[PDB]
């Protein structure tokens, strides 16, 4: 009775989410560069969001935040290209901080 990969994939939260556009997810700040927040939200790629003007000091490494997802991976195919150009990051809008 060993779980198969097909079973893990069916019942994974990322599979159950469906399309990522306009989906609220919880992210975690893992790296900070000046006012650029690098946030992991459970996907393949992190998103980069600028520090909000209000309560900017509350956003620190480890701070859990609320995001509105737009794309899991920003990619586009440009004229005369055989493959897609990827910037290796997700697109999301930082809404605020998650609190209990």
């Amino acid at each position: 009775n060993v779980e198969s990969f097909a079973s893990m994939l069916r019942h994974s939260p990322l599979t159950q989410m469906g399309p990522a556009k306009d989906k609220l997810v919880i992210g975690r700040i893992f790296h900070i560069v000046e006012n650029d927040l690098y946030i992991d939200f459970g996907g393949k790629f992190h998103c980069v969001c600028r520090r909000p003007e209000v309560d900017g000091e509350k956003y620190q490494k480890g701070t859990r935040v609320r995001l509105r997802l737009l794309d899991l991976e920003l990619t586009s195919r440009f004229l005369g290209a055989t493959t897609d150009t990827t910037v290796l990051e997700a697109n999301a809008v930082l809404l605020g901080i998650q609190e209990s």
């Binding site: 790296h31 560069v33 650029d36 980069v48 920003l74 440009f78 150009t85 910037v87």
Partner: protein, 86 residues
Amino acid sequence: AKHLKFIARTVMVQEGNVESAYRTLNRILTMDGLIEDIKHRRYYEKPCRRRQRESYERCRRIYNMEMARKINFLMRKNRADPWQGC
């Protein structure tokens, strides 16, 4: 000739600012293509030449729009170096 007058291509002057009224009229005629159309109509453009220019213009717009889209897309990563020293 047969139309009503002082409706087409007519801009009213505000507070005696005629320079701004003339610039607004010139901007209207430019955006609607009239200024460039009057100029091209001074001399006859031969049909083979008009098709060549209309095709060059169409392709320069597509190429400029595509090059702007590429630069915008690849400017997302213009942020500071996150892994400086590595």
